């Protein structure tokens, strides 16, 4: 059965007198560093010479190169892009990781690939959040959290489990739940969400926009209905709480509910489930891993080209027009990662 | 052309047309409760007209002046018909049309009853659509935070010549002008709204469910599979942040390079031609009257078939997994008690 840790199952006692080195200050690193500090945990940032180094300094952290951070740390969180783990592990982390220290990754991919490996005398774990940084930080400040998966890969000390779960409690994940899941399963599951589900959801939204525009509908209205009004996202986020079919039962007019249930369970041909299986096969059999290693070349040049090209697509041209014309509800984000 | 769109914000609307006027909110459901609460908090005189059911009692519990529909209409300058569309015809014929004052304005929140001829222009009166693009709880939460949701409007009949400023005064009072209120014909609004409900919403959920089913079949932990396809809130957060800054932009901003490379490997390539073809079939059913005939049949027995479909959907593996996940993982929520009581 499942092992799910909440606040009752974790404590900050294991972090008493210990220093955490957050390696990276990106989407995850900034959120971990901010929440650890506000939870009363001694934290240091290790970072290469880029904008994230300057940002960590601007937000009041003790910031050094990665080797120096690791050498002054009891716990090391490797929160940099996965393709970078191998070289940083070999050169900066492994030579400086104290005897009895804990190294944590936030995704299983570098463990599956053998780029991050158990070290004699040291602990190794995965603590993999199921949400990006801004919500982890916003939830933390509101007394809430996002879920995470964890795995104890190597435990020399016999104290790795409570130290990993203490980090999880300090960053807020035990407010939701931290479930035991093998790092190989986390890797394949996580990549599947990114490679099948996220693109399929955006492709469906784009398909709806294209068909409406083809059939003579107002492009601003078409863009608002398929996602830009926030209704489809609100349905999906409220659905996380109460269930997706339940949101329609509770919030839908009878007209809406009758229409929804006419086509619910009937919209997709078998080619969709077949492509999901093909994506999982690419993930499980190393084809994506090889593709990722290639794309990391000249600092992700091909990704830069794909990012720029996507902004020129009709959906994103229409998004810029709608967003300039309709005010979307936002909250001020200035100072979000400064000390609370 | 994009330049042709007529979009009103707060600077283009005022509460002045509502000075000394009473709005009758007919119905106190998903839309009715939000309209009533926001109108009252905006300083607009509001009454609720409702049949004898749980919504009558809720309106009283929430401090409103509540009567049957005919009495509400008889004492109002503006009437908002916020009940299910299939009920518009009988309520219009029996309770509204005979009681609507000279020079009063009737608004619907969906064009379907206008397309079908169940709600019609009345000599000496005004008729309009103000169609919110969001359900009630967000309209209310946004309103209380000084925000709003978009809406479409159409002036169908304007005896007084004052219908536009009165419709937009309602829109400002309920908060839609804080986002934007765009002119769109009631017929277009009808088909567009139905398309969102019959193609896009069920396809998004079917896609989430297909992901869940494939993961469970391939031996993944069902709780984890459920969390990743939506239960974590990540896919919802992606789509809601995407509404702000763009869907491809959320991935560029918030995704690890591993995530962005994976996403861009399959973006624009996941769906076969048959999905597009199905979207066109659903539009054909909506535009040609097939869906209107289906809906009339479904309603004719107080939605008995919908009750069966709602109960059957809760038994699907995705929804069984949802209850297991929800029990075991705490989801961030905000207290909702008293949300619709006076500010
Ligand atoms: N983004 C998310 O929502 C998310 C969620 C869960 C897990 N993760 C995991 O968290 C880890 C960090 O991902 P992220 O999304 O925060 O990444 P990111 O793209 O925000 O990472 C930027 C950070 O990485 C550093 N960096 C980049 N290239 C480097 C290199 N070659 N050597 C050293 N430092 C380098 C930068 O200086 C900066 O500190 C990854 O293992 C990722 O899979 C990400
Ligand atoms: N739900 C939404 O998010 C939403 C959004 C925009 C537009 N609309 C439109 O708003 C209107 C109201 O829809 P809703 O979703 O609030 O409905 P709902 O299902 O919440 O409506 C319940 C209300 O309708 C009343 N009602 C039901 N059957 C009735 C009958 N036969 N006679 C009289 N009153 C009756 C009930 O007493 C109650 O006040 C519709 O035109 C709908 O298309 C709904
Ligand atoms: C809850 C969401 C799917 C509803 C679509 C709504 O905007 C409304 O048009 C309705 O008829 O319910
Ligand atoms: C924003 C969302 C689609 C990203 C998936 C994230 O949880 C993370 O796994 C990543 O690698 O970026
Ligand atoms: Mg992830
Ligand atoms: Mg509707
Ligand atoms: Mg709608
Ligand atoms: Mg990931
Ligand atoms: Na337009």
Residue numbers in the entry:
A (entry chain A): 2 to 341
B (entry chain B): -1 to 341
Paper text:
A trait of BP bacteria is a conserved gene cluster coding for the biosynthesis of polyketides (malleicyprols) with a reactive cyclopropanol unit that is critical for virulence. We show that BurG, an unusual NAD+-dependent member of the ketol-acid reductoisomerase family, constructs the strained cyclopropanol ring. A sequence similarity search using BLAST predicted that BurG belongs to the family of ketol-acid reductoisomerases (KARIs; EC 1.1.1.86), well-characterized enzymes that play key roles in the biosynthesis of branched-chain amino acids. Biochemical assays and a suite of eight crystal structures of native and mutated BurG with bound analogues and inhibitors provide snapshots of each step of the complex reaction mechanism, involving a concealed oxidoreduction and a C–S bond cleavage.
Our structural analysis revealed that the carboxylate of a glutamic acid side chain (E232) is in close proximity (3 Å) to the β carbons of the substrate surrogates and thus probably facilitates the deprotonation event necessary for enol formation. To probe the function of this putative catalytic residue we generated a point-mutated variant (E232Q) of BurG and assayed its activity with the native substrate gonydiol. As predicted, the mutation hampers the transformation of gonydiol into the cyclopropanol derivative 6. Co-incubations of BurG E232Q with rac-12 yielded crystals for which we solved a 3D structure at a resolution of 1.55 Å. The absence of oxidized 13 in BurG E232Q may indicate a role of E232 in shifting the internal redox equilibrium towards the oxidized state by deprotonating the substrate and forming the enolate. By analogy to glycerate oxidation, the oxidized state is probably energetically less favoured. The obtained near-atomic resolution structure with BurG E232Q and 12 enabled us to analyse the bound ligand and determine its absolute configuration (2R,3R). The observed chirality of the bound substrate confirmed our stereochemical analysis that gonydiol had the 2R,3R configuration. Intermediate 14 is firmly held in place by ionic interaction of its sulfonium moiety with E232 and cation–π interaction with Y133. In contrast, the neutral carba analogues 12 and 13 show a higher degree of freedom in their tail regions due to the lack of ionic placement as visible in their crystallographic B factor.
